[PDB]
Every structure is written in C-alpha cells, then in structure tokens.
Design a protein around this ligand. Structure first.
Ligand code: UGV
Ligand code: UGV
Lengths: 304, 304
C-alpha cells in the first residue's frame, strides 16, 4: 500500500543523453542509433529567438559546427537535417546503449516521465502529464532543453516529448520526437499565452480509486449521478467532460473496488461542491489529476 | 522555473538490482561488488514472521538455498552471513555495473530516492523523506522488500535505505545498508505502531523559498518572528522545533531571495494559524515537507 507520483526508471534514457553545442548555445540531445535529436533552437543566439528564420539560420551551419559529446567522448557528425522543430544530427557511431524505442505523440491527459538534463548529464527524474491546454508543469532551467519525456512498456521506451521552451507564465512547451509542437506553441520568443488549464477528470477518478484501494475512503458517499448530471458540475469547475470511453477505461478500477464509476463521479461531485474541509486524500489537500487509470493499475499491481 | 518532487536518475541503482529467492520467498537484493544485500526475512515463511528466531532459521540454510538471479543469469553464492537485519550473500562474480558507492545512515528529515522493485526488476522511482518518527510514506507492495533508497553526489551513490516492512497503518519501515532499522521497528509480524508524524519545519521553509524563487509570493507578509516565538506555534501544530542550525542551513536560500529566515518563519506561522484559504503554493494545497534546503538549491541550480 501507499501511493506515490512514481516515475519510470530512467536508466534506459540516461544512456541516450548527449550534449549538443552550436556556437555558444549548449543543450541536450537524444542519441538513438546513429542519430542525435535536439531542439532546432540550438542554432539560435538569444537575439535570434525574437524573429528566427530557421531555414536561413540553418544554411550558415555545417556538420562540423554541431559539437556532440557523449559523456566525455566526441561524436563525429556526418549529416544534419531539420524535421519540423527538431534537428537530426547523423553521427558515425550508433549508440551502443540504444534501447528498444518508439516515437509516440501522446494525447492530453496522458502522463509520462521526464529525465531533466543539463550539458547532456541527467540531474533528476519526475512524473508529468500533458495538460489539456498542451503545456506541461515541469521543472526546467536554462540548459534543460533537449530533456525528454517517455513511457516504458517492459523494455521498450516510447519517447513522447522533448523540452523546448518556458512560456512567460512559467509553464513548459515542447514537441514530440518528430519536432511537432504539442499545442499551438512556436519556438519564438514572442507573446504565447496558454489556454485554460482544465482538470483531467478521468485521472482524478482513477486517483480516487487508488485512494479507496489504500484505505482513504472518507469521501465515499451514499449518492450516485449520471454522465450528463456529473458533467454539468464538471463544466462549472473547469473539469474535462467525462465520456463513456473514460468510464470504460475506469472499468478495471471499478471492478477491483466494487464501486461503480458513476458512484465515484457522485463522490467527486460532492468534493467539487464542498471541498475537502481540511482533510487529505492520499496525503494531498487537492484533487490530483496526474495519474491515468493505467498508472493506478500499474502502481497498484507492480508492473516491472 | 517550476518545482517538482524530483528523484535522482535511477540508472546506477538499476544495475545493482537482483532477485533473491529462498524457498518460496522472493524479494529484491542489492548487488555491489561480489556481495548481494537483501532483507534477512527472505528465509521466513508467512507463519515464521510471527515469532522469528533468525539465528535458528539461518542454521537450516546453506549457500545453495539462496537463489540469486541478475536479469536472467544465475549468480553462484560462495558464502552467507547475517549482519543485523540484512543478509550478505557473497557471490563469485563482482557486479560489472557497480558504481562508486557508500553506505550512509541518514537522519530523519533527510530525503532520498527509492527505486521500487519486484523480482529484482525496477518498476518505478520516487522521492521520499525519512519521517521524524522513522517511517517512510512510500509505495511498496508484496515483493518490494529489498528495494533501496539512495542519494547521488555526481557519480557516487549513497545507499541509505532498504525496504523491509509495511506496518498495519500502511506506513513503511526499513533499515540502513548495515541492517539496522531506522526507528524502533523490528522485522516481526507483531503490534508495531509508529509515533507522531511531525512536520519537518526546515523542509517547509526551504519549499517556501523555492515557491518565492518561482513566483508564488502571495504568502509573504509584513511580519517577522523570533526562534522561540515561531517554535511556540510550531509546537502547537506538531512541527519540529527549528534550531539555529536549521537557520544556518537555510542561509544560502535566504541570501538568494533576500528574505531573512525569521521573516519566512513569520510567513509560515501565518500559514499555520490561518490556512491557505483555498490557495495553492507550488500547486500544492498543503505545506510540503519533503524537500530539504539542499534539494531546493540543487533543483533550482541544476546539479547534475
Ligand atoms: O525557453 C528557453 C530557451 C528559449 C528562449 C526563447 C525561446 Cl522561443 S526558447 N529555455 C528554457 C529555460 C527554462 C526552462 N525551460 C526552457
Ligand atoms: O511487510 C512485508 C513482509 C512482512 C510481513 C511481516 C513482516 Cl514482520 S515483514 N511486505 C510488504 C508488503 C507491502 C509493502 N511493504 C512491505
């Protein structure tokens, strides 16, 4: 028993972290096979970031201008190309530590681990969620760009995110491993404001199931609700509308605890309308939305 | 910017996780050099745990009874000994992935990362703190015993904890890497109740500094306090007494923000007496006590 914001073991991803220097800019790269992936703003100076023309800026860069360093050895760059907002630096040596991997573009609400890096060296690992407004609430500093988000299925790593930028509101924006930004963000130093940060309803419900499985049951009540009734209350509190699909995904959690999904929605509805009244659920004084139904089942069953 | 409960990269520790089977009991072991460390209750059956005599139970066990498996290869056990509540299984092969390591016994209030394992395979990583009552609030299931807690200083791993047991209150108890339990716990299936879980005051103050550094300043007030005044309020709310030593340790955080430590104590005093009034600090609706002053400086400066 016990519930923690648990990240995937980062070992497989540490072996892929390299340092990419272009001029005076140093950031992190992801070395998989003979390719090093990094954010394309490595070729920019602070001033360039105001109105960058990446195709133009790229012309002035050659293979020998990108300094790729793995640990303390230098990698030879034999080719470079821009795919969307990521640069792909083809090196002559394939990464001996390349795990089985996939590049996946996640949906908002989905969660993943982040291995925060600086100078290609990992410094920490935390569990994040892709917010419904396509931002992430991470912990990134200058030099952290190129740090990646990932999921693991036994031995295969699914890379889903690369960090690119901090918006003026302190939230984070990045791309998938094909260079496409999540959301409407662009790699420019301009006025970019995120949309409403709604709460991931299916994730709070999963975490309420996780609490019940661990002994925290005070929030369980005698009431039930319907999808349309619950959603009228979810709308008012900036909670994502709950669909029959989310209900189905909570099925295994509903089965293990014997609490029908609509009964847990009615509990969540009361928590929304009345607050926690100074109480805690899983040691948290607010409704946690960064555990998916899959994460609860995984943590509660011990998937290695 | 941004503040996350960030764990150390687990790669160096994953390379040390092995599976230890003794009879029908399988748990996790820590393979450093030619020694495998595991909880001594590997030699017990569920029934034995009521009143175990480990020296007696150990006599009936030989080198060939301990099955040590690293990944999928079997390790040959050429010696075994009991040091306090841990077994040390000497194997013939030194772990090629042995990082630079130390065995340290941490103080309560100190924080560390946990690589939760099952069948010697890592499943997740989270950041914990050794509570003042010598328990930890982790996420451990059956099969998790032998999972370790650690800190990293650049490339050296300081192993500080091994998981041994879940108390009936769902909290966790374990030993340092010499087999000595933290707190008054014993590896018996008997009535063991933990003491008061007090809040780590110096850690909340550090996290208030971390919030100020990230833009969350609403809790800053016009007041100050003294160590004795603040402590009268800390006593009432089950907060650890703050010493001049804790004040000195917050010195670098006080210097970076320009907020005197006693001014932050007065802010904390108001938060204790009046609550958050529905507000959040660093996205948390309660006062977080699992970041030490060292962790704040590390996360906020990017120590790799
Ligand atoms: O945002 C940048 C670099 C950029 C400046 C202007 C851009 Cl457009 S991208 N670094 C950063 C710093 C702290 C946390 N996350 C990211
Ligand atoms: O506590 C035990 C095994 C023991 C039974 C009686 C003892 Cl004394 S030690 N496993 C466990 C399960 C879930 C989480 N943490 C630990």
């Amino acid at each position: 028993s016990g519930f923690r914001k648990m990240a995937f073991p980062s070992g497989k991803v540490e072996g892929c972290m390299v340092q990419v220097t272009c001029g005076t800019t140093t950031l992190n790269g992801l070395w998989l096979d003979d390719v090093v992936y990094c954010p394309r703003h490595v070729i920019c100076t602070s001033e360039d970031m105001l109105n960058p023309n990446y195709e133009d800026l790229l012309i002035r860069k050659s293979n020998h201008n990108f300094l790729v360093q793995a640990g303390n050895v230098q990698l030879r760059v034999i080719g470079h190309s821009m795919q969307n907002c990521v640069l792909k630096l083809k090196v002559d040596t394939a990464n001996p530590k390349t795990p089985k991997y996939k590049f996946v573009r996640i949906q908002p609400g989905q969660t993943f681990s982040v291995l925060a890096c600086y100078n290609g060296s990992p410094s920490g690992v935390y569990q994040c969620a892709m917010r419904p407004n396509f931002t992430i609430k991470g912990s990134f500093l200058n030099g952290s760009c190129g740090s990646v988000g990932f999921n693991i299925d036994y031995d295969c790593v699914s890379f889903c995110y690369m960090h690119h930028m901090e918006l003026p509101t302190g939230v984070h924006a990045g791309t998938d491993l094909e260079g496409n930004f999540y959301g409407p963000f662009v790699d420019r130093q301009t006025a970019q404001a995120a949309g409403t940060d709604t709460t991931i309803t299916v994730n709070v419900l999963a975490w309420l199931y996780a609490a019940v499985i661990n002994g925290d049951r005070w929030f369980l009540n005698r009431f039930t609700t319907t999808l349309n009734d619950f959603n009228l209350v979810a709308m008012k509190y900036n909670y994502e509308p709950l669909t029959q699909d989310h209900v189905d995904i909570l099925g295994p959690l509903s089965a293990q605890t014997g609490i029908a999904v609509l009964d847990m929605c009615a509990s969540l509805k009361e928590l929304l309308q009345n607050g926690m009244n100074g109480r805690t659920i899983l040691g948290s004084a607010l409704l946690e939305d960064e555990f998916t139904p899959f994460d609860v089942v995984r943590q509660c069953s011990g998937v290695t």
